[PDB]
Design a protein around this ligand. Sequence first.
Ligand code: FAD
Ligand code: FAD
Ligand code: NAP
Ligand code: NAP
Ligand code: NA
Ligand code: NA
Ligand code: NA
Ligand code: NA
Lengths: 329, 329
Amino acid sequence: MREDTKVYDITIIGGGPVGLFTAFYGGMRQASVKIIESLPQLGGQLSALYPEKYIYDVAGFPKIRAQELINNLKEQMAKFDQTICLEQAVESVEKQADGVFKLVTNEETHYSKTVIITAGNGAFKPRKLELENAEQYEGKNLHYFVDDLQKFAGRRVAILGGGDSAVDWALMLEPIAKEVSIIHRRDKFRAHEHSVENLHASKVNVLTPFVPAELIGEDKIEQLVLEEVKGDRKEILEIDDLIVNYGFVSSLGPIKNWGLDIEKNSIVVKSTMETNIEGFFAAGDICTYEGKVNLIASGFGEAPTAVNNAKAYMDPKARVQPLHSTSLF
Amino acid sequence: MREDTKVYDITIIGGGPVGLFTAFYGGMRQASVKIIESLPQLGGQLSALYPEKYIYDVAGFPKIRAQELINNLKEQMAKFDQTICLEQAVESVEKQADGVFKLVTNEETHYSKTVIITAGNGAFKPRKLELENAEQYEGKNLHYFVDDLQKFAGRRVAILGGGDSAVDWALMLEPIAKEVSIIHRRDKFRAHEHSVENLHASKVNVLTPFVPAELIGEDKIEQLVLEEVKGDRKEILEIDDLIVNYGFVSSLGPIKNWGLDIEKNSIVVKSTMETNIEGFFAAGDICTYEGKVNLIASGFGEAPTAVNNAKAYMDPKARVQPLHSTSLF
Ligand SMILES: Cc1cc2nc3c(=O)[nH]c(=O)nc-3n(C[C@H](O)[C@H](O)[C@H](O)COP(=O)(O)OP(=O)(O)OC[C@H]3O[C@@H](n4cnc5c(N)ncnc54)[C@H](O)[C@@H]3O)c2cc1C
Ligand SMILES: Cc1cc2nc3c(=O)[nH]c(=O)nc-3n(C[C@H](O)[C@H](O)[C@H](O)COP(=O)(O)OP(=O)(O)OC[C@H]3O[C@@H](n4cnc5c(N)ncnc54)[C@H](O)[C@@H]3O)c2cc1C
Ligand SMILES: NC(=O)c1ccc[n+]([C@@H]2O[C@H](COP(=O)([O-])OP(=O)(O)OC[C@H]3O[C@@H](n4cnc5c(N)ncnc54)[C@H](OP(=O)(O)O)[C@@H]3O)[C@@H](O)[C@H]2O)c1
Ligand SMILES: NC(=O)c1ccc[n+]([C@@H]2O[C@H](COP(=O)([O-])OP(=O)(O)OC[C@H]3O[C@@H](n4cnc5c(N)ncnc54)[C@H](OP(=O)(O)O)[C@@H]3O)[C@@H](O)[C@H]2O)c1
Ligand code: NA
Ligand code: NA
Ligand code: NA
Ligand code: NA
């Protein structure tokens, strides 16, 4: 456990589109801002679940690719300073006797005058490989996320999964790795058909329909045993790295342990976006109220409402209504 | 008075950015949509007051020119059918015994299952020329709006005002009209300095500091008498057309006569965006609630909230939550 003893003005739980616009608006109100995000990337549902898809109902965009929207939000907030804490899932939020919120994650303890939760459906986490010794290889050569293609250069790689992630990494690693194998439990992939076309055309070693049976290696993974689906025949791969792309899981989890008024897996908010805990606000898919719709455009309206009311809560001399952006820059 | 006997699903009062996105979302929910707007253009405050300025706090736009945002919204809604009624200010809204709303404007009577008011600060109207006989020349050769530059081709034009509108029309008409004069009550113009530079460089006849003293013409305006400010000297122009660009006025006006719960010139709404009158919703700058901020991004979140709840009000089989746009198109 580490501890950040800077009391931020606004600490945002979740770096999806709504959290990103919340962060931007915090900057507009000259507030110190921290984003805490479970994944090693920002972008929430858009980046994790449909980065390639075109969205048609965000105000002002006849169409926009989901990842492009996320990148635009990142560009928007780039004019201001934010502290971004990735690979941290908030487990505890408590308002201390002095009024300051203490937030504790799996890695670090944080402090804030206000908290704005923009957590969607809860903390995104990778689906884990359900093998007894799999955890022991985490932080060695068992990978759930890929942050650097070049670290596989000249190495033998096995990839588990049949989705766009597994297929994309396989094709991205083909020209870099010494050897790439992809293992999927079905002859049919989930990945986009054009990507699958490219996969079968490539020199990637496709193994279907197989599931991973065991990991052999005293310290580092050395061999991967596979078993055929609807067939009694084992396969053994000599590998240097194992990449697991079994998709994402989310749950509110400990979000339900903080004394919040929660209905139907959503945090209930007043029209100010404030929860039942003073100084604790919510916006986006995580929040609810009579008439709430889970949309990006709805979240993008809730974000500035939360920020501007948070600012007025912190500074009794500050007005809820912000100045015109057209003159501020 | 004319009468449109089609009962629309959603009738929107005001075609500013929030009304435009409301119209779009109506299409997304397969609702018949009408927009009624006071001005001969859509775009509200953006198009009327700052079309040239870059906005920095609309979600997903690092920067966007105000008129470009309006045009983007128009493009968004172009995929669906809307009936657009310009140059109509709604004066009366009444929910009839059958539950259908009757709306009456200066021109036309309309009917709707739901009304969503997106009126901002009230109906935009041009500042009128305060001369006893000025009204008699309306619809002849006295113009508050310019819809067609070419109808001034080869004609003698006088333009009143010192703002960007007066200056822009003067410069737009210079290569088209036989003769252009601009009359402003101050030696200093409000218009952007580069436009004023172009104005003084042009062949436009600049008359400052003058005010219009009287209109001569039995039927059509034939002569315009001007008087100098801080000076006793008259001027007489032979003109074919008079354009008055004295800017815009707005007021809620009759919006306060419809039985709505109004506080501080704003219509109070529940979190569904519904007013105190069932089936009558509000969004954007016209609405208020605890924590409301008058922003484009806020309005853009309120719009879909109003539409989706309006849809559920009209059709008890419809869910408030819409389908994903990413699959709908
Ligand atoms: C396939 C699909 C298509 C869609 N299409 C559309 C569409 O066309 N138009 C539209 O408007 N909407 C669409 N949506 C819905 C849209 O994605 C959501 O409204 C939007 O993602 C909500 O954004 P958010 O920032 O509130 O939440 P999210 O995007 O869910 O982001 C929340 C973030 O919070 C993080 N987090 C949560 N809890 C913690 C914690 N305790 N600690 C640290 N981090 C945490 C998560 O890891 C995540 O990154 C679609 C959704 C899906 C799945
Ligand atoms: C100079 C300036 C700079 C600004 N800068 C920013 C900024 O940087 N960021 C930001 O978020 N916001 C900014 N704003 C505020 C922003 O313009 C408003 O939040 C936005 O215009 C609200 O949109 P709207 O559709 O609700 O209302 P409006 O834009 O006011 O449009 C309402 C429309 O309704 C029509 N109408 C009203 N009543 C009737 C009636 N009875 N019958 C028929 N038609 C009617 C009006 O004619 C008008 O066209 C700025 C405003 C100004 C003036
Ligand atoms: N370029 C792009 O378009 C792109 C890139 C990345 C992600 N995405 C999108 O983001 C979302 C996430 O996709 P992603 O692949 O991470 O995850 P995904 O779509 O959920 O696919 C996960 C894969 O893991 C397999 N799997 C899960 N548990 C397993 C188990 N216990 N044993 C064996 N196999 C198991 C699944 O098998 P089954 O298929 O048999 O269920 C599936 O093939 C998807 O919608 C994807 O389209 C798109
Ligand atoms: N291309 C562009 O950038 C562009 C184009 C169009 C509009 N706009 C913007 O839109 C807004 C509207 O501008 P617009 O010119 O319609 O209106 P405006 O800026 O309000 O200017 C109105 C002009 O009318 C004059 N006026 C008003 N009443 C008068 C009276 N009774 N007698 C004499 N003169 C009178 C004013 O004089 P005084 O100045 O002395 O008060 C002013 O010069 C402005 O912010 C403008 O910048 C921008
Ligand atoms: Na997919
Ligand atoms: Na929710
Ligand atoms: Na101006
Ligand atoms: Na208002």
